[PDB]
Amino acid sequence: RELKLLLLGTGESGKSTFIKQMRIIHGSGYSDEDKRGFTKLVYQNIFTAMQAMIRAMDTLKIPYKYEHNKAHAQLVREVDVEKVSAFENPYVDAIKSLWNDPGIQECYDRRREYQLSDSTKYYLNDLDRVADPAYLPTQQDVLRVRVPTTGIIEYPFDLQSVIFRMVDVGGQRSERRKWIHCFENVTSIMFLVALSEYDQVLVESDNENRMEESKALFRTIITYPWFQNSSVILFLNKKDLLEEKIMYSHLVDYFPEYDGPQRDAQAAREFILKMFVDLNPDSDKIIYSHFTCATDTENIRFVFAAVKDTILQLN
Amino acid sequence: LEPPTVVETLRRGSKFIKWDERNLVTLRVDPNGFFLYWTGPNMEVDTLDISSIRDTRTGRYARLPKDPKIREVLGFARLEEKLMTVVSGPDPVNTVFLNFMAVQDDTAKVWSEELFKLAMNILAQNASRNTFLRKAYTKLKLQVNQDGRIPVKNILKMFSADKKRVETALESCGLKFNRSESIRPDEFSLEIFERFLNKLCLRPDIDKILLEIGAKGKPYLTLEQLMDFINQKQRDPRLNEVLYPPLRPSQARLLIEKYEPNQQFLERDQMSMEGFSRYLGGEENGILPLEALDLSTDMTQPLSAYFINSSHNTYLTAGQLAGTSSVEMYRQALLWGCRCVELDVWKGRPPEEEPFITHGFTMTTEVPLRDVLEAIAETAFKTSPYPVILSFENHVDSAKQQAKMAEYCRSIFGDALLIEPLDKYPLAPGVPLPSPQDLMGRILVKNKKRTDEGTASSEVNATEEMSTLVNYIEPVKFKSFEAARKRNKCFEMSSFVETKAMEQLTKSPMEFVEYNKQQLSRIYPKGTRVDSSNYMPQLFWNVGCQLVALNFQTLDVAMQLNAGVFEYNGRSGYLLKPEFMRRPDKSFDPFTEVIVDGIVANALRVKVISGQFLSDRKVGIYVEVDMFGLPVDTRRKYRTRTSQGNSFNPVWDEEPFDFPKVVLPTLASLRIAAFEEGGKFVGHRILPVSAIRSGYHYVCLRNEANQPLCLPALLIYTEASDYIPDDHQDYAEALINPIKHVSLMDQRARQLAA
Ligand SMILES: Nc1nc2c(ncn2[C@@H]2O[C@H](COP(=O)(O)OP(=O)(O)O)[C@@H](O)[C@H]2O)c(=O)[nH]1
Ligand code: ALF
Ligand SMILES: [Ca+2]
Ligand SMILES: [Mg+2]
């Protein structure tokens, strides 16, 4: 037999990254041909991150440090991002000059006020490794790409004793109308909450908080009459970005009920788990919680092995 | 896809000696890429439309002179490289040749290559409404009299749906109102033709659009209302909000500087009525996006997962008994985007041993095989570089004569003929068929190895000569579906007749789709249809048959589908099957009545608002709206009431046509056809349900062989959105905005505590 597992969660939360780890751990991994098929999307995420950082300079009114670097800004500002196939010489020379500017690094420090990806520093620090003509994307470079999901895709995975049908859905506000056609015969709901969302606002609505919607989507999901015998497995993604974000920006400003001390990535990790577990009206049904990191293949292999025995014991 | 740019040697105009089976003309193309006009023999121009050119041949592939009177005067070999033949027609059966012979050197090949890029362009065929009104204006500016003036009878025959209103329309603009006078083309600039299509066709349907979207203040549309026009009405509500983002106030100001003409209203960021009536026909407000037309489909799947375009008895021009076969029907089919042609080869004459192509004992004329194999070799990959499958039918019962048709395939096709299998995919059980990208330019033959069918049930066993060419697609005698699955050879195929595949359709449709996930299946119409009537191919596309073969002669409702759904994917003749008909882990019933688990349904709602310029006489016009998909989607066929007698600006006050449960929307296809009173055809347009937008759009109707018409167009208002089941449509409103719902949820629990 097989089981149908849902991967639900809000936008930019790391659902397809959890699928890519299943393709690496419990499936057919990325070979030398499949890694080379991803090299055009790594170039497109370098330009999408930079063009959103260039247009973040005038709306925040931050002047550039060097005037020589400013002449490179209008060159990258007019790159059509979808028609990028190669990474040529004036394109690398402009962005590598644009990354070392102290006025850009002040705009990157204030990246909570616009929409920027979470792998925008992994790419524009290994830019010497990504620009070379013999560029093959390594397996950590493939897990950091950003291709936004639309629709319902069903991935089956063989574990030599049972087959898991992991269903990958979207996360945006226009994509939650399509979640209805995968709610039939659901074994488990793997809810994926990014822990580093507690200061950014939504891309679909630039006023509401990101953590307060994932908190509100978890309240809606487990209070359906439909999911009355389904074991909801709460994943807390992005455990690495919490350790960088908590050291300068706090949790108390965006949540007034945080009594814990500042700069404490372990005590704040419990409080967000205290925030999500407490939204359960029935105490007889319990929620299996797991902190995780979706690009650490050991930290998916350790967690999913604890999930695979949790599903098989209850079923 | 590039816009149709004209190379400057096609605008200055070279000199050809136009001849018909000796007058010197100068061919020119207008600077938009619309017409091909030449100063005729009577000092009057004759414009051949560029968008109705099938092919432009040159070199030794052009038509040679056969009259000794015309051969000597032309100068008859260096004279074989100057001949240019432009073949054009409304249907592939009746084509009008246009022969030219140049006088300068090396100019016939820059012409006939660039003349084929304009006549096979995708952004000119799917161009906007304002592009097609400009095409009718260029038709007036080119066709002049001896004096170089536009006669008023030339404007009168165009809008022949009225006469008295037209003559007073030109009189209001200060032009010549009398019928037998002539306007000079200096005083007929395109600004005046805008005022002439406004003072003649008064449209009250746009004024119900302006009053709807918030212009209670009558003169102008405010900029803040116009962003709320495009982001709500015109935007497809199934798309994502990160991939295709909504507009910005800086972004939706480039439209006002592009469309709004009044500068006293342009500086205040306001769009007038004349600026809004231009925007709906703009290039941005099209019924189909740019990505739906280009070669954008995944071409790496096996060949067993693609709807291949096909043709049955391609060599015929008419019915199966009375007609005359022609070699020209192979060229006119393969340029259309057909990929599977048929060849019924017979044993030749005793003194002149040469095989021919005919029909079996039906008194049809016989064309030689060596002329037909030159036809498929010439124009296989002129419009799409994808593999052509020559469906032979060997009746040659001579082992000697088979070496002639074996050497003809190796000598004429040559490098492109796939003799040996590809190195990645051997001829082993269990390995799938290759991909269409893996054989870009490879011609595959189809022959044997070593009552309702007529000729196709009796064919001789092939010998060692013709069996070496059959490698991947090999026809086998059909036994069952259990023996087709326990054998597990994914390269063999079996061709069904129409009446045998229909009893195999209802006996077991769940096993028919799983046979097409591995192997191919050809379907051809039976021998009872002796008048070349084509069955509906959507009966066999719901079970995933690939080579559904249709008679390309007669363009009934069936051929209007088969030429409509393959215009997409870049006119390549290969549509990808939906994702549940080619995955071996999933399986679904094509005769379902509920929404499939995993397949996103849709809920289409089409409503016909009005029409423009539809016909040339005072008749009534109605509009049919069908949907060709799964048999659960096809149940509703709607039709408007006829108009009062207007063929000029007929308005339909109709309720919307509700297509509520589109179960498989990545297969179904809308069909908006407009007829006349009495049932005379005017135009039709087939749109897929996946990529049809929303809001008040334009539809430019096409004729029967899917060529675009210049003047006639409809105006529809669609609402293509995702289907929510009626049992829980309120638990899908809490997902879309869960912030507002979680504040309302505890509020209903707190107020109950009191
Ligand atoms: N640093 C870090 N980045 C992550 C982690 N998990 C996900 N991401 C990033 O989150 C981004 C968006 O995730 P994505 O798979 O696109 O989620 P989806 O849009 O719902 O499909 C990806 O670019 C990942 O690189 C993590 O544990 N650590
Ligand atoms: F949830 Al997403 F791209 F934002 F899959
Ligand atoms: Ca035949
Ligand atoms: Mg995803």
Numbering used by the authors:
A (entry chain A): 38 to 352
B (entry chain B): 13 to 33, 38 to 92, 97 to 470, 575 to 878
Reproduce text from the manuscript describing this model.
Basal activity of PLCβs is maintained at very low levels in cells via two autoinhibitory elements, the X-Y linker, which occupies the active site, and the Hα2’ in the proximal c-terminal domain (CTD), whose mechanism of autoinhibition is not well understood.
We determined the structure of the PLCβ3·Gαq complex associated with lipid vesicles at 3.4 Å. The sample was prepared by combining PLCβ3 and wildtype Gαq bound to GDP-AlF4, purifying the complex using size exclusion chromatography, and then mixing the purified complex with lipid vesicles composed of 2DOPE:1POPC:1POPS (wt:wt:wt). The structure of the complex contains density for the PLCβ3 catalytic core and the proximal CTD, but the CTD linker and the distal CTD are disordered, suggesting conformational heterogeneity of the domains with respect to each other. The overall complex is very similar to the previously determined crystal structure, including the X-Y linker engaged in the active site, with a Cα rmsd of 0.84 Å (10). Despite the disordered distal CTD, which was previously shown to be part of the PLCβ3·Gαq interface, the interface between the PLCβ3 catalytic core and Gαq is extensive, burying ~1,500 Å2 and involving 56 residues, 27 from Gαq and 29 from PLCβ3. Compared to the structure of the catalytic core in the absence of Gαq, the only conformational difference is the displacement of the Hα2’ away from the catalytic core. Despite its proximity to the catalytic site, the Hα2’ displacement does not induce additional changes in that region. Despite our finding that the X-Y linker is involved functionally in Gαq-dependent activation, we do not observe structural differences at the active site or its interface with the X-Y linker, even with extensive classification targeting that region.
